Design a protein around this ligand. Structure first.
Ligand code: CL
Lengths: 243, 243
């Protein structure tokens, strides 16, 4: 082990409470999610963990989680890089629907196929979708090269657009000795975990990363983990996450 | 006029209430200062002003002002660049002293000379100073080239280390059509104002930029202002600042 990497999945959003697919909808943290971020900040501060550079998405539930960590650890001065490549999976036409609405519109067996599939995408977000203008036409995506803006993503698609950011931007920083923090989303972090651990498609779909709980990796010089991921927090919080 | 630039001086810190020289001491915003930041955010949102990139210092009173603006304008996803070159003036050995303590330690006439001088620095922050380890040895300055870390600064010194950041980093972004926001400190913003307006040393020492109040410049293609700075806010707030 040579390098320490820390990742955090943001806590609960307002739409997670409504069992509503958020995806690229820019949902706010709930009060519970903000408290989870503060808990993770305390754990990082207590462990005396310093960072040198931070990465997040363009979605405020992740950015706010990062901000809470930086505030609570007195690291507000650190460089922060945002990228759409760390965004949550794009749920396509399912964006904004709850579980019952999704099932009524698309079929229970069909929705089960999508939920359990690594590589079958949900339906596209088309120009008639209520959130099309506010997502697909939003100026924060205007710099994407033609062909990069998704209408929908399978998990395979999400991972395929996240990994290039890891390889080209994050990994060289780690190799230079920088201590990285990544505050992002379950499915984008899954892409990094899958790569670090060399996991199968099935294995990554069985991993539900705990929320607001910092995840610590120790990596060798080739960025290969030398031991299992560890969670930071109070004993009880950590024991639960280990389950 | 071709380009719009917005700058904001952070609001009141906790030490401004104690009439204590903060400088590079990383003082928090007061409650009043946080409310001023929120007021400025509302004014920017009401004016429908979009930015593409934001600059701030490594001091949390400025960073938090920026964060408040980004939150209040739904621009949390914007790129943010921090630099020590936008820090407040380094007050040297005066850091942490209030007005009476400064006068008792250094002399009333001497302090007046320093207060009214553009180019005479205050005394250096030496290794015996109570804040030496927490400022001069702080890891956020470990990347400065040897010779760049000050022990003290005149206003002339502050401006001389701020302007290179304007010339090399901010100005090319503006010329590419990017809409810049700068959230910083009175004395670092003075350096930019002095340059934009071609002001004398005396004139810049007479300018006390309002706090938390966004300042709007319209610049031609050579980045020369085409009209006087304007303040954003409610009528009454703006009228006061115009005084
Ligand atoms: Cl930031």
């Amino acid at each position: 082990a040579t390098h320490r990497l820390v990742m955090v999945r943001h806590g609960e959003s307002t739409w997670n409470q409504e069992n509503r697919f958020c995806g690229w909808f820019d949902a706010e943290l709930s009060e519970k999610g903000a408290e989870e971020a503060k808990r993770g900040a305390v754990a990082i501060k207590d462990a005396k963990m310093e960072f040198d550079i931070c990465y997040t998405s363009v979605l405020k539930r992740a950015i706010r989680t990062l901000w809470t960590i930086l505030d609570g650890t007195d690291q507000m001065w650190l460089p922060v890089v945002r990228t759409w490549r760390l965004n949550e999976r794009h749920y396509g036409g399912l964006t904004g629907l709850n579980k019952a609405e999704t099932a009524a519109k698309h079929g229970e067996e069909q929705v089960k196929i999508w939920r359990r599939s690594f590589d079958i995408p949900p339906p596209p977000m088309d120009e008639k979708h209520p959130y099309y203008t506010s997502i697909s036409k939003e100026r924060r995506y205007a710099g994407l090269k033609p062909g990069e803006l998704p209408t929908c993503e399978s998990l395979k698609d999400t991972i395929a657009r996240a990994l290039p950011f890891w390889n080209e931007e994050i990994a060289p920083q780690i190799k230079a000795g920088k201590r990285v923090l990544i505050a992002a989303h379950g499915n984008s972090l899954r892409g990094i975990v899958k790569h670090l651990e060399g996991m199968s498609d099935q294995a990554i779909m069985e991993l539900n990363l705990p929320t607001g709980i910092p995840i610590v990796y120790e990596l060798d010089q080739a960025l290969k983990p030398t031991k299992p991921m560890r969670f930071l927090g109070d004993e009880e919080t950590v024991r639960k996450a280990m389950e």
